[PDB]
Each structure stands twice: as C-alpha cells, then as structure tokens.
Design a protein around this ligand. Structure first.
Ligand SMILES: CCCCCCCCCCCCC/C=C/[C@@H](O)[C@@H](N)CO
Lengths: 283, 268, 213, 268
C-alpha cells in the first residue's frame, strides 16, 4: 500500500534512558544493517514529517531521455566519386557512458523503450548553392533481415521491417517499443559464454567472447537521406535519445567507479585511481 | 532460549552430510529468498526434469586455501566450483539445462589472540575484468572457470603485454572488486563478515538468480563467491602468521533438463 | 575565454605556487566569477578551492589562496600547496563560473619532486699502475637521479664508473668517480657536470688532484 | 531476558549524549532516591526557576587521569568539578541559588591478565582535612575547589610548616578517607567497586542531598566523589604498569533561582 510519494515517517518525542536495552550496540558481521533512528541514541522532539521519496523511485530516477548515439549520414553531388553516405548503427546503451552507468546500478532490468530522434543538418562546402528540404528514412533491421548495402538498394522497401519517415525542420521523431528480450529480463551482466569449448573438437571452434550472449542482441538502426543526389553537398546528424519507461529492476550493484573500457567490465591501465588525497584527521 | 539455544551455535543437515558450528554470527538468506524448485507458472523446458535430491543436494568440501599477511583475496564461481563434485557434476554435464541454489559455508577459525576480518561476498553475475589493454572481453573459457581451486585477487593491475600469445585471463584488482567498482560498496550484495574476534565462519543461503527460469550451467555461472581481507591477518607478534580458510558448499532444490550424452569440456 | 598557462614544475621541498590565469576578453566581461579547483585525484568529490565571496577552504588543510577576493577582480588567481610532503600527481583542474557562457574551463597539471646537491673530493696517493688519483663527484639527494657526467681536458676521460641509487628518505643518491690512472700532474680543470634540469646552468664542479710522493 | 538482556550490558542516554557498556556490575541509586525537581510543598525561593533541561542535563567528560602501582587515590567535588562545563556552568554562575542531581559514570578498562580494585565512593558533604597543625578549618576556597582536574589522596600526613606563608590546603590521607575516619567503613556510603576481573566501570545515580531544599552551588559542594585503590594495580609481570581512569558525569533534574549578573570567582 505505501506510495512512492507518501510522507516519510514522523520523528517521535524521546526522553532520557537508563536501561538494559542496547540499540547503539551491534554486530555488522551478521551481514545486517542496524535499523537505528535519531530517537534511539539521543533525546528527540516530536516532528511531523512532510518529506517524500517520490523523485528517487525507479521510474522517476530514469524518467529522462538520454543520448545513446550520434548517427552520421549525407547526400553528395551525383558526380562525386565517393558513395552516398548512409548510416548503420548496432542498437545499444553502451556506446555512451551516462545512461549506461545508471542502468548498471543493477544486474537485471525490464522495460518499455521510448526512442526519440533529434535530426540536425548542415552545409559542408564553402559553396553557395542550396538544397530542398530533406526527408530521412530510419529503418529498423532486426537480427536475420537483409542489411542495406546501398543508400538506395531493395532493402529500403521495408515491406515487413518498421521504418520512420522523418521530415527535416519538424518536431523530433518518436516511437515506442515493448519489452523485446528473448529472456524474462534484460541482462546488464552475463557471467559466462555463448559457446562450450568441447575437448574432442578443435580449439578455435569452441571459442567465444567473455560476458557476451547473442552475437546480435537487438539488430540495427539503418538511416539514410531519401532525397536524390544534390549538386551542393549536405551533411546530416541523427541524435538518438533513449528513455526507459514502465521499468523494473533487480539485484542492486555498486556503481562504475572507473572509466569504462569497452562493452564489458574491463578496466584499463592509468585509470584505476579515482579517489583523491585527503588526510585521516583533516575536516 | 532460556533452554539454551543461540545465534552463534548452529547445525546444518543436507542428505548424508552435517555441519556444526559453536561460533557463528547468525546466517544470511540472499535477498530474503530461500532456494526453490521451478514452478509450473514460470517453467520453460517441457520435458520431465531430473531432480537428484540427496545424491547432489548435499555438502561438498573444496580444497582448503591458506590465509596470510600477504593474501589479497580469493574468488570462486557457481556452479563452476562444483563441476567435478560427485553426482552433482555428473548430472550437470549430462544435461543441456540446469538450475540450482546453494548453501555456502565458509570455515575459518583461529584464537582469542589473533586479529583479522574476512569479507565474504555472494555476487550475482560476477563478471570479472581481463588482463588485456589492447583488446576486451577476451578472457578464455578455460581461464574464466578455475573449477574447485578457484582464483585470486591482486593488489595491482598488470596488463598482459604478449600480443603474440595472449595469457587470455583475468586481472581482478582487490580494491575494485575485480570488476571496475569500489570494494567498500560490495556490501550492497548478500554477505557476511568473518571477524576473528567474533566468529569462526560465514553461512550464506543462495537462491537461483537469473534473467531466465533455467539456463546452461556449463556456459553460464549464476553466482560469484568473493572472499577478501577487510582487515589483515595478524597474530601475537609472529611476522608471518597463517590460518586456513576451508570452503564447504551444498547445492539446493536443484533440477535438470534436456538429457543427452555427457558433455566433455575443453577445460585446459 | 580560457588561457591557463599552468604546466608547472613545480619544485619540491617545498614549496611553490600552483597558478591559474584566465585573461578576460574584452567587451563581454565575466561575472559571477567564482573559482573552483578540483584535484585529480580520488575526487568524490572534494579537495577544492572554491571562492564565492569569502574564500572557502574545502578541506585540504595544506593550502594557501592568494586572490583579491571578497570583492572581485576577476580571476587570475594563484594557489599554493604547503606542505611539505610529495602529495603529488595525479593532476589538478581550474574551473570558473559565469553569467554569460563560462560555467566551464580547463584541466591543467604537472610536476613534482626536484633537486640534488653536489661536492667534489680528490684522493689518494699515486702508486701506479694504474687507476684512481682520485676525483669523486658525490651527488646526494634527488629521487629522479641526476645525470652525473665526468669530463676533463684530454682523452684520458673514458673511465667513468657510477655508484647507483641506494635511496635516502624518498630521495635517490649517487656518486660518479674517476679514475683517471697514473702518474704526476696537479693540475687540470677536470669538470663534473651534474644536471637534473632545475636551477640555472647545470652544476659544473672543477677540481685538482692528489700528487704524491 | 531469554531474549538477550543483561546486568553487565547497559545504555545510558541524556540529551545529545549516549554511554554504552558491555562489562558493568549493575548500577547504584544513592539511598534508593532517583533525582527530582523541587516540589511546591518543599520549595523556598518564590521566583520562577530556570530549568536548562537538555542544555545542561547531559554527559560531560572530565580530564582522564592515570592509574598506577604508585597511585594513592583521587577526589572530586560536585558541583565544583562541572563548574566550567558548557551551559551547566554558565547557568550555575548566573544564579544565586541552584540544585542538582547527578549520573556519575566512572570508566576504567584493562585485560583478563590485569589485576586490581577501584573503590568508587559517593560521599554527602565530603568535608576534607587540612594541611595545618598550628591552625584549623583553614583550607582556602581556591584549594578546596580544584574544579574539573580534582584532587588526590596521600598515603602519609605531612603538616604544612611554613607558618609565615601557609599552603592553606588539604592533606587527605588515604586510609583515613581524608577526613578522620577509617576507609574500611566508607562502604556505608553510596558506592560501587571496579574490580578489573569483573567490570569496566562504575555507575552511580546521585540525588540532590542537603539540609536545605536549594542552596548556593558556588559557596557549597553537596557531593564528594572519592576513588581509591582497594587492591593495587597489577599486570602480567611489568614492574610499572598503567591504565587510564576516565570520569564522565551528567547533571540531572537540575534547577536554578535568583538570576542576576554573572559570578566571577577568584579561583587562583
Ligand atoms: C523504427 C525504430 C524501431 C526501433 C526498434 C528497437 C528494437 C530494439 C530494442 C532493443 C532494446 C535493448 C535494450 C538494452 C538491452 C541490453 O541491456 C542487453 N544486453 C541485456 O539483455
């Protein structure tokens, strides 16, 4: 029954004590934390508590759109020798550090995902020619489906795959995604491997990455500029904001204390000394 | 009990094995959840499961390690550590899938004149950091799984420099819990402290924890048992004292699915 | 704009200053102008020089703050760390706050220890052949070892063996000696050049020789 | 309590201060009377009294003294000893009259291998003997009131012979309780014994005692705290051992009358 936004427990008036009861004394060895309160070790007055833990709730803590990646695409002049640049990003929360550290305060997680897309474009050459309003195509390519090889090949038809046709200058694109995990909950950490090295079978064959499950967790985001090659080249950037909604978390963990080094828990030399100098007897 | 009963004195009995202790600091039950069999509402694999019961759900005592002024800490992984233990290891290898809880009993006695504190921690999905700075998540299956003898922590991070023929193994630094996070905070995890002046040991009852109802026991390790010296071993005046740390563990309410021919892993 | 020059040795003993200059352009002048210093450093999250109105010492007792504060200037402030132990690096940062855009600055850091001392001693009596007369170039007290170099006047120099580092309190010590062989004269300006790259020009010590009978 | 509770382990809490003890020999309440405020039926001074409560009725820890093979004993006087203690001393000096009870907690720990017994006594109107044989009742206000540091007992009576410029101070001989009576009988007075092998300390709860309902706290000392070695300190084999005796005291149900300008005594 207790709501995240209900007022915390009121402080009760407490007088002097000369008894056989020893709240202050305990034994951390047992694995437990002393449930003590001000009134147990000192003389307290009566206080009607109005404060709440509303903003510190799991949803409230993550109820914010966080940048997980920056995709770069473009639309050159037909003539250019180099290919029209279309973006292919492998979906994940580890390419950036902020949101990853927050999710990582916990072992397992569960949640509906809200993806918001902020698109910005600009001119690259000290030219003067212009360009008509661009229309972007954000296609979701799930593991197994034909991944695009050309800004304009057959795959962009998206007969089955989900595509978002964004129009430049308009309110940032947005879509919702359910809990799509092949497991009963997302695994922020996997203490094992995708393969079992069998004696009877050649070393190289049974080999696999540590802490890495499905080589292709959730497929990829394939972005392109639908508009045909324009005399004057225009480069665009797609910023992807990820927000975890209707979220649940299990088994808490100590926050990442040192600089992230790859998709795993690996740390790197020269970054292992976080804490600063401060003397035992100095305030 | 005015009758005699007490927190410090316990008696644990599983199958044909019984453990007694006159100096315990009570016992801990991970996340308040006592080990249990897979429920029908939560079940996945449709085949009649194999439940060894007393044959596997009993107490196995691993190789006794030595605690000294120099020791930086020790680590083990479940089920990996029990992989070669009687009928439990046999049933684990014969089946594709398997799930199990554990009763972890860490034994370490001394004397009223000795000092020291062992921080005993039960960590879910205890992913450890590798020995390489040129590559990542590269620690080999053979090295990531020491079996019964387990592994150990280092006071210093020293990168594998042999690019040609990589050690392909873990470099778990003590103060960083071997995984990029500050040891001082490891306590958010199910644990107990073996403080020589207060108690002989640590008893942790661990439930089956995981993103799935049941999984591959051979490919994946559910729990990590980390033992670090919070306060260094110390005795009378001896410059180089020593005391044994014996680790006894018992699988619980454990069950297996997908029976076939025995799995012969490349453990070396 | 940010123009901090602080890449400073930094001399040990100690003590020296840890400055921070932020020259201000120039027609869009800066306030509020509080100045923060964050160490680098197990920063969770303080060993800080912060200065709102009155200069506040975030607890690293061994600090000296010298800026025209409680009023304003604004900040080309100087800090000082004494002392006197090698509470080293690591690194240090210097961040300002601004009403316009400038709740921001730059991390800027450097060096540490320092410096040695030298003397020359020459003996003993020449009974040859054919080693020492003997000139010794003692080098006491310098953790980053001072590159002692014995040279002289002639091709009778290739002969220069070293006492390595059996370190004193935190600080390394060495002795280069020669040898130089045999026979007679006084008499040459045999010069030991001890460096370390601190002070002025490298410690050039010229001496004589013990000639006997 | 089959639940755990015990005579040896106590927790005392007054205002913002709390004292804990795992090795106590219970606690003593002088004459079976717990400190209390001045009743209307027994009141004298007609003006609204000043009751500091938590600001003064808390635990003050005096300067820690050292117990050794040589020590003959220590003495203190109340309220004198607390005269310079925070808000309690301030309120005592600002008022003509004042009354107060006390919770006296004498702390003194050692080891299972140490020996010795501290006789801790609470004496009403503890009038002590002077250093002069040519004159009497001559001990000066400055010397009769040592304040927080208190005074000490002597194994021998040595008379002040300087007739010209008299020391004008006390010569309290240990075996005579510093007052003409045999120490062996001091036990008729509210007390507790700190026997190293049995307990860490002594807790005495003292009531306001006196021929009057309320009096001059600055001119007159109601209680005397005497601490003498019944059995001499002794350790293993060390010829000159040592252990600290820390004395912590807390004023109780204390109240004051006749408010005016602060009293600046000639304490030297
Ligand atoms: C047109 C836009 C369509 C967008 C399609 C998005 C579907 C894919 C969402 C995958 C969600 C992944 C969230 C993070 C999971 C990781 O923590 C896993 N390694 C843990 O199990």
């Amino acid at each position: 029954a207790a709501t995240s936004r209900d007022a915390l427990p009121n402080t009760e008036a407490s007088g002097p004590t000369h008894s056989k009861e020893i709240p202050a004394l305990t034994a951390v060895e047992t694995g437990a934390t002393n449930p003590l309160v001000p009134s147990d070790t000192v003389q307290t007055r009566h206080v009607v508590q109005h404060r709440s833990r509303s903003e510190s709730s799991i949803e409230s803590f993550f109820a914010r759109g966080a940048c997980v990646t920056i995709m770069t695409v473009d639309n050159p002049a037909s003539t250019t020798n180099k290919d029209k640049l279309f973006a292919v990003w492998k979906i994940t929360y580890k390419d950036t550090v902020q949101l990853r550290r927050k999710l990582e305060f916990f072992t397992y997680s569960r949640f509906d995902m809200e993806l918001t897309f902020v698109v910005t474009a600009n001119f690259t050459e000290t030219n003067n020619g212009h360009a008509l309003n661009q229309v972007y195509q954000i296609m979701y390519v799930p593991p197994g489906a034909p991944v695009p090889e050309k800004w304009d090949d057959y795959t962009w038809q998206t007969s089955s795959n989900p595509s978002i046709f964004y129009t430049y200058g308009t309110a940032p694109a947005r879509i919702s995604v359910p809990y799509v995990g092949i497991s009963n909950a997302y695994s922020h950490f996997y203490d094992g491997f995708s393969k079992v090295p069998l004696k009877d079978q050649s070393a190289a064959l049974g080999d696999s990455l540590y802490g890495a499950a499905s080589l292709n967790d959730f497929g990829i985001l394939a972005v392109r500029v639908v508009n045909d090659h324009n005399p004057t080249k225009v480069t665009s950037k797609i910023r992807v904001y990820l927000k975890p909604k209707h979220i649940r978390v299990w088994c808490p963990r100590p926050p990442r204390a040192v600089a992230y080094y790859g998709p795993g828990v690996d740390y790197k030399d020269g970054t292992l000394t976080p804490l600063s100098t401060k003397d035992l007897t100095t305030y | 009990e005015a009758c005699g009963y007490s927190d410090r004195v316990l008696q644990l009995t599983l199958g044909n094995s019984t453990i007694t202790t006159q100096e315990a600091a009570n016992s801990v039950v991970a996340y308040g959840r006592w080990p249990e069999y897979l429920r029908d509402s939560e079940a996945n694999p449709v085949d009649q499961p194999t439940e060894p019961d007393v044959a596997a759900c009993r107490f196995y005592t691993l190789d006794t390690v030595s605690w000294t002024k120099e020791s930086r800490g020790w680590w083990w992984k479940l089920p990996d550590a029990l992989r070669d233990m009687g009928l439990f290891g046999q049933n684990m290898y014969y089946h594709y899938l398997g799930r199990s809880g554990y009763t972890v009993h860490v034994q370490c006695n001394a004397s009223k004149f000795h000092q020291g504190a062992l921080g005993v921690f039960a960590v879910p999905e205890m992913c450890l950091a590798g020995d390489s700075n040129t590559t990542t998540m590269h620690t080999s299956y053979q090295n990531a799984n020491p079996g019964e003898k387990g592994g150990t922590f280092t006071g210093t991070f020293t990168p594998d420099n042999n690019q040609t023929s990589p050690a392909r193994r873990f470099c778990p630094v003590d103060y960083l819990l071997g995984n990029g996070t500050l040891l001082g905070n490891a306590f958010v995890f199910p644990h107990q402290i073996i403080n020589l002046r207060t108690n002989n040991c640590a008893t942790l009852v661990l439930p089956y924890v995981n993103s799935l109802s049941i999984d591959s026991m051979v490919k994946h390790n559910n729990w990590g048992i980390a033992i670090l010296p919070l306060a260094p071993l110390n005795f009378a005046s001896e410059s180089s004292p020593e005391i044994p740390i014996t680790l006894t563990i018992a699988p619980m309410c454990c069950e297996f699915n997908g029976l076939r021919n025995i799995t012969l892993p490349r453990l070396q | 704009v940010v123009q901090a020059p602080t890449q400073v040795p930094g001399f040990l003993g100690d003590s020296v200053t840890l400055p921070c200059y932020l020259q201000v352009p120039n027609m869009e002048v800066t306030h509020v102008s509080q100045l923060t210093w964050a160490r680098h450093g197990e920063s969770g999250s303080m060993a800080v020089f912060h200065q709102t109105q009155g200069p506040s010492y975030s607890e690293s007792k061994r600090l000296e703050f010298v800026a025209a504060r409680l009023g304003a200037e604004l900040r080309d402030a100087s800090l000082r760390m004494f002392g006197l132990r090698v509470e080293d690096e690591g690194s240090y940062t210097c961040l300002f706050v601004t009403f316009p855009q400038g709740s921001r600055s730059v991390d800027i850091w450097l060096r540490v220890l320092a410096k040695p001392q030298n003397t020359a001693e020459v003996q003993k009596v020449q009974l040859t052949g054919e080693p020492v007369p003997m000139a010794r170039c003692v080098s006491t007290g310098g953790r980053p070892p001072a590159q002692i170099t014995w040279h002289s006047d002639l091709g009778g120099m290739p002969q220069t063996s070293q006492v390595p580092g059996f370190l004193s309190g935190t600080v390394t010590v060495t002795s280069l000696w020669i040898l130089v062989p045999s026979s007679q004269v006084d008499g040459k300006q045999v010069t030991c050049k001890v460096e370390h790259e601190s002070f002025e020009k490298p410690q050039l010590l010229t001496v004589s020789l013990t000639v006997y009978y």
